[PDB]
Ligand binder design. Structure first.
Ligand SMILES: COCC(=O)NCc1ccccc1
Length: 185
């Protein structure tokens, strides 16, 4: 792909984070802490899952960023509507305002309803995310495999401003402590 020139500098919004997440001082890395991180509750925080949003809101144009997933067992990445549900249980689907992929139990899947199997020969250490607001497109690229396409959501109905979306995943296994990191431009 040739989307690199739409690169945007994403930072994490502390105020949207689940109360167990630790966001780095530079707001470019996030990991799940071993306990509550001593923050007050607010209506923005994701309650049930270890999720956080980017600070940036997109309503037009073309945007590209990269995320490092090295040595993680489980994670979700993509974009979502600014107005997605924060509290209680919900599924990641376009009907709920999410355009995401994920890793879970050694398989990669796109957050369609129902979910779609992805065909990945080279486990990615970094993921590229491309959004074309006007075209209604969200695309995912395998940076480890020379930028090969993972998945394209097309005919997206964003229906609002978009925010970068992250889930560091559960760490029941003790094998998923590693952070998500926004990779430099
Ligand atoms: C440490 O691992 C246990 C675990 O993953 N618990 C579930 C959970 C943790 C934090 C926020 C939401 C849900």
């Amino acid at each position: 792909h040739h989307h690199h020139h739409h690169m945007v500098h994403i930072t994490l919004d502390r105020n949207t984070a689940n109360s167990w997440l630790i966001i780095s001082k530079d707001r470019r890395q996030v990991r799940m802490g071993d306990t509550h991180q001593n923050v007050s509750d607010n209506k923005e925080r994701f309650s049930n899952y270890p999720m956080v949003l980017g600070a940036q809101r997109f309503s037009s144009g073309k945007m590209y960023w990269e995320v490092d997933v090295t040595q993680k067992e489980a994670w979700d990445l993509g974009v979502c509507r600014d107005s997605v549900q924060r509290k209680g249980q919900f599924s990641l689907s376009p009907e709920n305002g999410f355009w995401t992929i994920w890793l879970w139990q050694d398989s990669y899947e796109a957050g369609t309803s129902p979910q779609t199997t992805l065909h990945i020969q080279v486990p990615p250490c970094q993921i590229g995310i491309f959004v074309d607001y006007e075209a209604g497109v969200v695309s995912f690229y395998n940076i480890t495999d020379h930028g090969s396409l993972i998945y394209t959501f097309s005919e997206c109905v964003f229906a609002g401003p978009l925010r970068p979306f992250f889930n560091v995943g559960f760490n029941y296994s003790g094998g998923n402590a590693a952070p998500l990191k926004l990779c430099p431009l």
